[PDB]
Design a protein around this ligand. Sequence first.
Ligand SMILES: O=C(O)/C=C(\C=C(/O)C(=O)O)C(=O)O
Length: 293
Amino acid sequence: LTNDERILSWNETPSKPRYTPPPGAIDAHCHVFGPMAQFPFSPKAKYLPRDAGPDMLFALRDHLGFARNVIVQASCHGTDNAATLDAIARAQGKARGIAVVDPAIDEAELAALHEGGMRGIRFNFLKRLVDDAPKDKFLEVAGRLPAGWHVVIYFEADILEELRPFMDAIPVPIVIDHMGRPDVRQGPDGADMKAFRRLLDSREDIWFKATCPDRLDPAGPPWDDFARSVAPLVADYADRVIWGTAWPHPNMQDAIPDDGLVVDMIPRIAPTPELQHKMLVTNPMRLYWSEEM
Ligand SMILES: O=C(O)/C=C(\C=C(/O)C(=O)O)C(=O)O
């Protein structure tokens, strides 16, 4: 199934960001897709993306001015982490990863994923992406992970309440993708942000990605609602926040973001050198390269 027939969801000639990330900056949420010929997609995949391999990822990384990446297993590859693992290997020390695993995965396989640069697993509660999300089995496997791993959790705001018991029971630290998709139109003190802050206030070891204005702010760039709603969250939880591009933007074909503009959101949500250093360097290093910290 030929590449130019599959779904393009990224800008092939992104603008240069006006903002220059600091030395050592980490794009802590990105993906590779395939290449399909070497790494086929999962039968459970709900989208069939165009190839977005390691060389494309590193070209994008370099174009935007990032030093390192956390390469997150994409749902189009299911529980086969091979493409992600190859991308991490090809990064020559400049990447770590997040895996998606069968909840029955054995400890030997988990150790091998660790050796291959994985530092956590992802639980995806979006039905449009993954049919099944067995909370019982997720809780089980979350307690069998290699030392120093965390879980990454992706959900929509309308199920945050229902997930509070599950997240409270998770025995390792938690990273929340895209803040659990709050409606940034509401403002920084709106309903979704208040609910999200209740979650953050329940456990000290819940971190979040301050990410994806393209996904959350339907007005489009400059995404003023995202900027105004998210900046206070970054400022109030400065030691618990990380950031990523979300390139190559799975499922964003209807509103393909310009990565230059995506990166230019950073100094809006993190206006000071202090917040930029924490969000882009210190915090993701603590989660993903703890041995260097
Ligand atoms: O990659 C993201 O950050 C978000 C999306 C896709 C996935 O989480 C995935 O396929 O693994 C989405 O919202 O469509």
